[PDB]
Amino acid sequence: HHWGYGKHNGPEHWHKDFPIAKGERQSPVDIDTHTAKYDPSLKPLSVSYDQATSLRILNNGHAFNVEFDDSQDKAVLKGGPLDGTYRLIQFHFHWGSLDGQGSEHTVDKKKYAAELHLVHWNTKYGDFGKAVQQPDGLAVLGIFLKVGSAKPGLQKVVDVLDSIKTKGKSADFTNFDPRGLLPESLDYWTYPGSLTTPPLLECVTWIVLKEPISVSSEQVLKFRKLNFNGEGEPEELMVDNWRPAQPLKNRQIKASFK
Ligand SMILES: OC[C@H]1O[C@@H](O)[C@H](O)[C@@H](O)[C@@H]1O
Ligand SMILES: OC[C@H]1O[C@@H](O)[C@H](O)[C@@H](O)[C@@H]1O
Ligand SMILES: OC[C@H]1O[C@H](O)[C@H](O)[C@@H](O)[C@@H]1O
Ligand SMILES: Nc1ccc(S(N)(=O)=O)cc1
Ligand SMILES: Nc1ccc(S(N)(=O)=O)cc1
Ligand SMILES: Nc1ccc(S(N)(=O)=O)cc1
Ligand SMILES: [Zn+2]
């Protein structure tokens, strides 16, 4: 009964070990596009990934993380709602058992097939661990995935998954360019929220891009061949690793675009 995504240990149970699950700033949320308001105070968003240094890909039993060298300002996120510089540490996805579900955020209640999270920490706090003690410690860039044409910049990820099928397996994953996971437009919504997995800490400025990326059915089908379980254990396919939308409470979602 470690946390997970089963009927016995999924999102409806997390509050028992992580009472912040019922907090005032939880994520994800439904993005009501008609209520979100353009904010002229937002500065231009800068996604600066040209010098990124990927290192490894890990099946952590809940998703797979592509990890980056964050020992210095190499891949960073600035501008928009953010004060200062946020350094890329890892990205991962959430996805469904079927194309009709998988995203964490929803857009006018619409669920996408998957959602990419590029996770960054505020460099003024020195390390990720200190950043998650702060109300402005993290910035997560969220990108929706729909199923259509293949995303060429995702294929290297897809093709390594057979080598990290089970929990605890990792593989080298150097020289991966995360620019290849972005859509064309950087239009976004933003709001203050939390990590979407335990420990559910309320440290995140969410920046959710409006434009989805398209991936092929074959690409997302390979996500669904991963396992939540470790090697040797009964196979439990890694699917439906998403938390549903949580109450908006006393928050407003701002839009970068008129
Ligand atoms: O290899 C992935 C990326 O790594 C970066 O460090 C390089 O500067 C980019 O040119 C390259 O696309
Ligand atoms: O009092 C007026 C203000 O209300 C706030 O809730 C909105 O975020 C602002 O955009 C608006 O100017
Ligand atoms: O860029 C990520 C990975 O893509 C492919 O798997 C390459 O064969 C490997 O060398 C690289 O680490
Ligand atoms: N019954 C139960 C208790 C706690 C959890 S947890 N680790 O997700 O909070 C899950 C199920
Ligand atoms: N330094 C570090 C990088 C990535 C991660 S991970 N596996 O949580 O993405 C943890 C620590
Ligand atoms: N450690 C951690 C980092 C990011 C997230 S998420 N799913 O909110 O990006 C959850 C936990
Ligand atoms: Zn996530």
The separation between CA 184 and the C-alpha centre of its own chain, rounded to angstroms, equals 18
Ligand 4 centroid distance, CA of 18 (Å): 9
The experimental technique used to determine this model is: X-ray
Three-state DSSP class for residue 63:
coil
Q: Is the CB of 127 under 6 A from ligand 1?
A: no
Distance of alpha carbon 123 from alpha carbon 86, whole angstroms: 6
Q: Read off φ and ψ for residue 180, nearest 5 degrees.
A: -70, 0
**Eight-class DSSP state of 34:** T
The separation between CA 44 and the C-alpha centre of its own chain, rounded to angstroms, equals 21
Joined together, the tokens standing for residue 192 give 């203050």
Q: Read off φ and ψ for residue 42, nearest 5 degrees.
A: -65, 135
Q: Does residue 224 contact residue 99 with C-beta atoms inside 8 Å?
A: no
For residue 222, give Cα distances in angstroms to 93, 225, 254.
13, 5, 34
Atom 3 (ligand 1) nearest CA: 177
Q: Ligand nearest 119 Cα, by number?
A: 6
The separation between CA 23 and the C-alpha centre of its own chain, rounded to angstroms, equals 20
Joined together, the tokens standing for residue 145 give 């995935």
Best residue among 57, 174, 177 to mutate for probing ligand 1's pocket (most ligand atoms within 8 Å of CB) is: 177
Residue that is written with structure tokens 């797979």 in the block: 64
The pairing of strands 138-147 and 213-215 is parallel
Q: Read off φ and ψ for residue 76, nearest 5 degrees.
A: -140, 160
CB atoms near residue 41 (< 10 Å): 6
Cβ-proximal residues to 80 (8 Å cutoff; 6+ apart), any chain: 42, 43, 44, 45, 46, 188, 190, 207, 256
Q: Is the dihedral of CA 251, 102, 68, 50 positive or negative?
A: negative
Best residue among 7, 16, 22 to mutate for probing ligand 4's pocket (most ligand atoms within 8 Å of CB) is: 16
Please enumerate, as own/partner, the contacts of 49-53 that have beta carbons within 8 Å and a separation of 24 or more. 49/75, 49/88, 49/177, 49/178, 49/179, 50/179, 51/75, 52/88, 52/176, 52/177, 52/178, 52/179, 53/174
